[PDB]
């Protein structure tokens, strides 16, 4: 399992969970360097838990799938809640079985679904170690619209970092402060399952993406990213969807 505490964190803190969160997902081989994530891995070894405790103390446990780092669902004190999605029924077959009640959550855990949930896109909601906190605080108690912006803001600073370390320093340069995400950040997220695809099938081209993958950069400027020496590929992403998944 992987734990994060707010109580007392900081960048450094940060840094050390989103370490292990990425070292804790297992992976046989790398491609360029970044490891590639399982096809697949059965029963109850394909999700992982994350013990996360809010500023107070409190925690909750969110069950990711170790092959694509989806967050399936998770456990407040006595009550489990999961998305509406088979992925998550099926992982409500593994873990937290033993809470007294279990809820299904009104909506899948796609960014589509949460935001119409929300209200609102994620581009306009803070993310941050302030608002993780907040977040973990707002699931600890059910309320589905509430829910849904908690959740937004758990998988950008929880998977989404893990990802790319671009977006775990966005994390890290809002240890006090929230902001929402920049649009770089945005377009990283959208852009996860295309960058894995495409560093993966350059394997056998020579390097070269078969099709170009089209970021918004730290300017605000869109770009093409066209082969594995872009500096997406070579110092920001850190694990890679496998294709099998794609
Ligand atoms: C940890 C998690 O659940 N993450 C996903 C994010 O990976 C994905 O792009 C988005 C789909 O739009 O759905 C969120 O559920
Ligand atoms: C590969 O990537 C860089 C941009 O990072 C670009 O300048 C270069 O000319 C590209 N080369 C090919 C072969 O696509």
Do not use: C
Request: net charge positive; charged share 15%; aromatic share 8%.
């Amino acid at each position: 399992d992987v734990s994060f505490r707010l109580s007392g964190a900081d960048p450094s803190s940060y840094g050390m969970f989103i370490k292990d969160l990425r070292n804790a997902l297992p992976h046989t081989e790398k491609v360029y360097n970044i490891p590639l994530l399982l096809p697949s891995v059965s029963g109850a070894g394909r999700y992982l838990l994350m013990h996360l405790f809010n500023y107070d103390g409190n925690t909750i446990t969110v069950a990711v799938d170790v092959t694509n780092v989806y967050i399936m669902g998770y456990l407040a004190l006595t009550t489990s809640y999961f998305f509406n999605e088979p992925a998550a029924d099926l992982a409500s077959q593994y873990v937290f079985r033993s809470a007294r009640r279990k809820i299904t959550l009104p909506y899948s855990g796609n960014y589509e679904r949460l935001q119409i949930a929300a209200g609102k896109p994620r581009e306009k909601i803070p993310i941050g170690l302030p608002a993780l906190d907040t977040a973990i605080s707002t699931l600890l108690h059910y309320d589905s619209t509430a829910a849904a912006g908690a959740l937004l803001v758990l998988i950008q600073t929880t998977a989404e970092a893990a990802r790319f370390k671009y977006i775990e320093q966005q994390i890290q340069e809002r240890a006090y402060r929230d902001e929402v995400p920049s649009s770089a950040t945005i377009s990283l997220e959208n852009s996860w399952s295309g960058l894995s695809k495409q560093i993966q099938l350059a394997q056998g081209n020579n390097g070269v993406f078969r099709t170009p993958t089209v970021l918004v950069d730290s300017k605000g400027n869109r770009v093409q990213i066209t082969n594995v020496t872009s500096n997406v590929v070579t110092s920001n992403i850190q694990l890679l969807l496998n294709t099998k998944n794609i």
